[PDB]
Amino acid sequence: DKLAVLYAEHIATLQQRTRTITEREGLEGLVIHSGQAKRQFLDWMYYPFKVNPQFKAWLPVIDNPHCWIVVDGASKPKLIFYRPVDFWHKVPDEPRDFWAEYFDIELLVQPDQVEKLLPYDKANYAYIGEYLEVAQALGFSIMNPEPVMNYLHFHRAYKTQYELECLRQANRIAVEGHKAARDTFFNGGSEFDIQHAYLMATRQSENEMPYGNIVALNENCAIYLYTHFEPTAPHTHHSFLIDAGANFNGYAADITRTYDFKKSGEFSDLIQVMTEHQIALGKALKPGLLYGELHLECHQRVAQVLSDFNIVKLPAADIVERGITSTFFPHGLGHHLGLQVIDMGGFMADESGTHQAPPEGHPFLRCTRLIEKNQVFTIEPGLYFIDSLLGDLAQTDNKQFINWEKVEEFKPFGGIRIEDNIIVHEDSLENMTRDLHLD
C-alpha cells in the first residue's frame, strides 16, 4: 500500500510533464511503445525482452511486448495491454495490480491488430519507441522527436517519491545478493559460483539483472567491464570485485564492493583507505554543486592514495598535475541512477538538451549536471593495476616516479571499486546502500 499511495502523485507528475511538452511542441499526445521480442536469425527462439524505458517510466510492466500508452496529460492515460490467449503459454489475469485503476485498459489479443485501437488521425501524435518501420506502417510521421526526448530525459533526473521508494527496494534486494556473493568468495568459490549465489539470494535470474554483473577474482578485478564467469576457481584467492544490482518495478540498483581474501596485508589496507575516500565523496554531494567538481575531488583523493601507499613517489598535487591518476582511475566517478542504470539527463544544463561542459582536464566525463534534491547518484571511485595503461605509463617521462616493484605485488589483486547509491534531499543525503548495513 505505501508504494500504491505514492504512485498517484507519480502519475500526476507524469501527466503534468506530458501536458507541458506536448503543448510546447504542438502535439496532441505521445504514443509510447513497450517494444517487441526480437527473433534470432534463421531461428524460432527470441532474445530476452527489454522494455522501452519511456514505457516503464509510466508503470511497472517490464516483461510485456506489444503494449502501448497513449497520453496527452489531460485525459486519463490509455493502455493497450497485450494479452494473448494461447494454450502453450500461461494466460495471466487481466491487469488488477495497484497501477491498473490509473489507466483506461484495452486488451490486445494479436500484435498486428493494434491499428484499430490507436488514434485515427496521427498527424499530431509522436511515436516514442524503437520500431520506426512499424510506426511508419501504422501512419505515424513523428518519431522520437528530439525536443520531447530531451525534455523527458532532463526531468527523469528528478525522481518522484514513488521512484525513490522503488530505488530503495532495488537496493534492499541487491544487498542480499552482495552478502551471499561475499560469503561464497570467502568459501573459495569460482566467479561462476559467486554469480549464481548472487542470483539465488536475489531470487532474480541473469536476464532480470539491470546489467551484466561483474564478478571478478584476482587479476580480473583490473578489467573494469569484465563480463565472463570462470567456472573453475583460481588456485589462489587474493581479491574479489563484484558490481551487481537488482530490479524493482523497472528501477535499478548498482552496487560495487571489493574484498581481500586474507582480510589483512597491504591490499586489505588499500581497500579500507579507498572506502574512507568513497564515503567522504558520497558525503560531498550537495545541491548547487556541479557533479564534475566531485570527479575532480576524486582524482585528488586517488592521488593521495597513490602517494600515501608509495605506488607513485610524488606528493598528491604533482600526481594530479602530471595526469598520472588517469592510469589508475580511468573512468567517471559515477552517474545518475533510475529506470536505466546510467540514467538519462546526466549531461544536460537545461530542458532543451544543451550539454553542461565537463571540467577542463576531463573532456570524456558524461555526468556533469548541477546536483539538486530528489536526484539519485552512484559514487564509484576506483584504483586499478591495468597492464596496457601501466605499459603506456612506463613509456612516459613519469616512469621513474612509479614504484614498479610495488605495482608488481598489486597486479595479482587487480584493483578496487566501491560503489554506493545515494539520494540527494534538500537538507540531507540518504545512502541507500550503507543504510542497509551491507558494510
Add this chain to the structure above:
Amino acid sequence: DKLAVLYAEHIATLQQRTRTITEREGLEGLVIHSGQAKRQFLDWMYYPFKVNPQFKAWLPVIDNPHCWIVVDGASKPKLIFYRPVDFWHKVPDEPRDFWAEYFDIELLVQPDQVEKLLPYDKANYAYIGEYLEVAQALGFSIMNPEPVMNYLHFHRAYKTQYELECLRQANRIAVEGHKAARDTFFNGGSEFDIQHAYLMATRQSENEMPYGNIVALNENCAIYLYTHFEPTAPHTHHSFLIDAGANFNGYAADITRTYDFKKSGEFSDLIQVMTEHQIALGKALKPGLLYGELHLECHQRVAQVLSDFNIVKLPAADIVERGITSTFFPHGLGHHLGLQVIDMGGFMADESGTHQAPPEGHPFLRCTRLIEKNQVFTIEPGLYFIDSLLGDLAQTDNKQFINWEKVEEFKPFGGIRIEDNIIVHEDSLENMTRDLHLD
C-alpha cells in the same frame, strides 16, 4: 585431440558442400557474417550475443561478433577474426585453438574497418548473414540467396563425425544438469531453485543454454512452453517436468524428464507407461522411414494410454480416428537436433528445398523428412491435461467420451514429456541420453 582429429574431415565436408553449391549457382564465394551485438533502445547495454548458425557451422566461435568467413570450397577458408585491444575488456590470445590452422586468419581491431579485408569486387559473392543494410553498404548485392540457404540447410541434417562428437559432449553436460534438477525437486525446491541447481551442475549460465529451460511444478507441467521460474515452492509437491539442454561448440542437447514426487500412485504409473512408449518410439528410428510414420505411431500409443487409464471411455483406435489424441498430445513427436535446437532441413524432400508433405491427419507436423544415417533426432512424446484444449473438447460431440472426473484428478500433476536425443547410424541407433545412465 579426438575432436581436433575429426575436425579435419568436418572442414573437408564443408569445403565440398561450398564448392558444389557455389559452382552450381555461379558464385565466386560465400561471405558468412557471425553477426553483431544489438544495443538496447536509448541505452548503452547490449542484448546477449547470438551467433549466425551459418557461421558456427564452420568453427566453434559463438561469442565473437564482427567475424567473417570467406569460402569457395577450392582455397583455404579465410577468417576475419574480431580482436579489439581495449583496456576495459579481456584481450584474448590470437586464435591458437585446434581450428585455427584450418583458416587463413586476419585480425580485425575495429568492426567498421572490415571493408579493407573483404573481396574488392563482390558481384559474385553471396553475403550470408542478418545485417542486410551493413552488407549493402559494403557493396554486396546477393544476400541469403534461397538456393544456397536451402542446399546448406538440406545438408545440415547429415552430421560429420566432429558434429556427432560435439552433440555427445552437449548431452553429457545436460545429463549432469538433469540429475541435479531431479535431486533439487525431491528435496522440495522451487522452480527457481531447480533452474539454478541445473545451471550450477552444467557450469553454464542462462544465456549459454541453447533455449529457455522449461522448469515446471504441478499444474505448470501442462503449459508446454511455460517460461517463468516461481521463486517460492508450492505448498504441496506433486510433479516436475524439466526440458533443458546444454551447449558444446555451438551444438545443442535437448532433454526432457517428468517426475512424480511420491514415486507411486496413478500419475507415477502414467509416467512409467509413457516411458515404455518413448523407449519403443526411440528404437523405431530407421533409415528409409519417413519421420511422420513415427508421429502416427506416437498418436496410437498415447491413445492406448488414454483408453487403458480410463481417461477416455473408448477403444484406442477410436480415440485416434476421432482426433481426440491431439487434445492430450498437441505437438510434434520431435525434430532434427544440431547447431540449432530445432535443426534445419527437417521439412525437406531434396536439396532445392521442396517440402516433404506431412501425414494426412497431421498437417502442422514440421519434421517430415526421410530418416537416413548420420542424422540426429529428438523423440519426445507427451500427454498433458491442458485447460483450454479440454475446454474446446468439452464443446465438441466428443464431450460424452471424456472421463471428466479422472481428468480432474490428473490436473494438479499437469502432464508428461520424456525426450531423448538419438543418432541414427547405418546399422544401429545411439541414444546419447540413455547411454549416459540419466534414467
